[PDB]
Amino acid sequence: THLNFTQIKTVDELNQALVEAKGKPVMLDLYADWCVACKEFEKYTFSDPQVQKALADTVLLQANVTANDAQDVALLKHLNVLGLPTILFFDGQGQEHPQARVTGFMDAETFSAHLRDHHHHH
């Protein structure tokens, strides 16, 4: 099984997705078909009900940079991404918190702990 991502391609598209998500946290997954740890996230981590349920109230975005085309490269540069896998997290105000970035494989337990570490105005 698999998470329900919304694809974005460009910097502009990311920004409008963040505008529409405003009020809910966001996770942006940076993916490529050739990225082994990205496939491992799908196999071991995003497939785990604990992770799925933990992410149920998060807007999930994905950028597929497989081609490394001009738009992909501009997005990666804009986000100061150094390589894959990278997962970024934005709060409900749209602010990215760099300490939350995930830049290597994490199993379900580790990823869930990362996610843990604003609900109904609390």
UniProtKB/Swiss-Prot annotation:
Residues 1-117 form the Thioredoxin domain. It is found in: Cell inner membrane. It comes from the Bacteria. Residues 1-117 are periplasmic. Disulfide bonds join C35-C38. Belongs to the thioredoxin family. DsbD subfamily. Required to facilitate the formation of correct disulfide bonds in some periplasmic proteins and for the assembly of the periplasmic c-type cytochromes. Acts by transferring electrons from cytoplasmic thioredoxin to the periplasm, thereby maintaining the active site of DsbC, DsbE and DsbG in a reduced state. This transfer involves a cascade of disulfide bond formation and reduction steps. The consequences of replacement of the cysteines with alanines were found to depend on the conditions tested and on the reporter system used for the analysis, and then differ depending on the references. This is Thiol:disulfide interchange protein DsbD. It comes from Escherichia coli (strain K12). The lineage of its organism: Bacteria, Pseudomonadati, Pseudomonadota, Gammaproteobacteria, Enterobacterales. The chain holds residues 446 to 562 of 565 of the full protein.
